[PDB]
Write a protein that binds this ligand. Structure first.
Ligand SMILES: *[C@@H]1O[C@H](CO)[C@@H](O)[C@H](O)[C@H]1NC(C)=O
Lengths: 191, 97
C-alpha cells in the first residue's frame, strides 16, 4: 500500500525525467498500444560513464551497454494515421560498447488503440553484486487510470551481470506523431 | 581505498582468482609510463562490481559540481611506471576470475 508516483501521459503531458533508481524500482506498464518501450540505466546521463539501454524496438529486445551520447529527449516516433514506427532517436554516439544483446525477431503492436488499457506489465529492476535482476509480471487488465489493487507473482527472466554505474534512469516513451504527440498511458516508479 | 570506491568495487563474499605476472619490460619505461590513469574522483562511491569511465569533472568527497566550481578537477590521475623503481611502482597485469 505504499505511495506510488503516477506519471500519466496525455496529448500534452510528456514525462520521462531523471528518476532515481536508488534501491531499485517496481515498474508498472499500464499499456494499450505499447507506449513505454525502453529505459536507459546510468548515472551521468551522457557519453562519459557506461550506461545500458534496454528497449523493445517492436522487432527485438535490444540490450546494449556503451557510452551512449544520451539524447536529453529519448523517444520513438510512430505515425498515428499510418501505424508504423518512423524514428529510433535514442543515441547520438556509442563507444566502448561493453554489453550487447538483441533478442529474437518478431513484430509487436505498434499503432494506437483506444478504450481501456489492455495489459499491465510489471517490471522489477535490482542492482545487486553487479547483476541487474530483471523481473517480469504480466496479466491483463481493463481500466482507465489509477493503478489497481492486485495480486500476482513477479518472475525472473534476466539475471544480468552488467556491472555498470546505475544511480538514475529514464523512461523511453513513444511519440505518436499524426510535430510530436502522445496517447493515453501511465507508468509508475515504485521504490 | 582508491581502487574499490572509485575505480572498481569488489564484493566480499563471492570472487575468484587474481592472475598477476611480471610486466616490467612490457608496460613500463625508466623515465615514466604517463599513458594509463586511475579514477580518484567520484560524486559518491561505487556499488560492488561496477564500472565507471565518466569523463565528467567531480569532487573528491561527493560534492555536487557544476564546473568551474570549488574542488573540481580531472577525474583521472597518473601512474608513472618506472623500470628503475621498487615493486610498488612496477606495472603488473591482473586477471580477475
Ligand atoms: C500515501 O498513501 C497513503 C495510503 O497508502 C495515503 O493516505 C496518502 O495520502 C498518500 N500520500 C500522498 C502524498 O498522497
Amino acid at each position: 500500500y505504499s505511495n506510488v508516483t503516477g506519471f500519466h501521459t496525455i496529448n500534452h503531458t510528456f514525462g520521462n525525467p531523471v528518476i532515481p533508481f536508488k534501491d531499485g524500482i517496481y515498474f508498472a506498464a499500464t499499456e494499450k498500444s505499447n507506449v513505454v518501450r525502453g529505459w536507459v540505466f546510468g548515472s551521468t546521463m551522457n557519453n562519459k560513464s557506461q550506461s545500458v539501454i534496454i528497449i523493445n524496438n517492436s522487432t527485438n529486445v535490444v540490450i546494449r551497454a556503451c557510452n551512449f551520447e544520451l539524447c536529453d529527449n529519448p523517444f520513438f516516433a510512430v505515425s498515428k494515421p499510418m501505424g508504423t514506427q518512423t524514428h529510433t532517436m535514442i543515441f547520438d554516439n556509442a563507444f566502448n560498447c561493453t554489453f550487447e544483446y538483441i533478442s529474437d525477431a518478431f513484430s509487436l503492436d505498434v499503432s494506437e488503440k483506444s478504450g481501456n488499457f489492455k495489459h499491465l506489465r510489471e517490471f522489477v529492476f535490482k542492482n545487486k553484486d553487479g547483476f541487474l535482476y530483471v523481473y517480469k509480471g504480466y496479466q491483463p487488465i481493463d481500466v482507465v487510470r489509477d493503478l489497481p489493487s492486485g495480486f500476482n507473482t513477479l518472475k525472473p527472466i534476466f539475471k544480468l551481470p552488467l556491472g555498470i554505474n546505475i544511480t538514475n534512469f529514464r523512461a523511453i516513451l513513444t511519440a505518436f506523431s499524426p510535430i510530436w504527440g502522445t496517447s493515453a498511458a501511465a507508468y509508475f516508479v515504485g521504490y | 581505498g582508491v581502487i574499490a570506491d572509485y575505480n572498481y568495487k569488489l564484493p566480499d563474499d563471492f570472487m575468484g582468482c587474481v592472475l598477476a605476472w611480471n610486466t616490467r619490460n612490457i608496460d613500463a619505461t625508466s623515465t615514466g609510463n604517463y599513458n594509463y590513469k586511475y579514477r580518484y574522483l567520484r560524486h559518491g562511491k561505487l556499488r560492488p562490481f561496477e564500472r565507471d569511465i565518466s569523463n565528467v569533472p567531480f569532487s573528491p568527497d561527493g560534492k555536487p559540481c557544476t564546473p568551474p566550481a570549488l574542488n573540481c578537477y580531472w577525474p583521472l590521475n597518473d601512474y608513472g611506471f618506472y623500470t628503475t623503481t621498487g615493486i610498488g611502482y612496477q606495472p603488473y597485469r591482473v586477471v580477475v576470475l
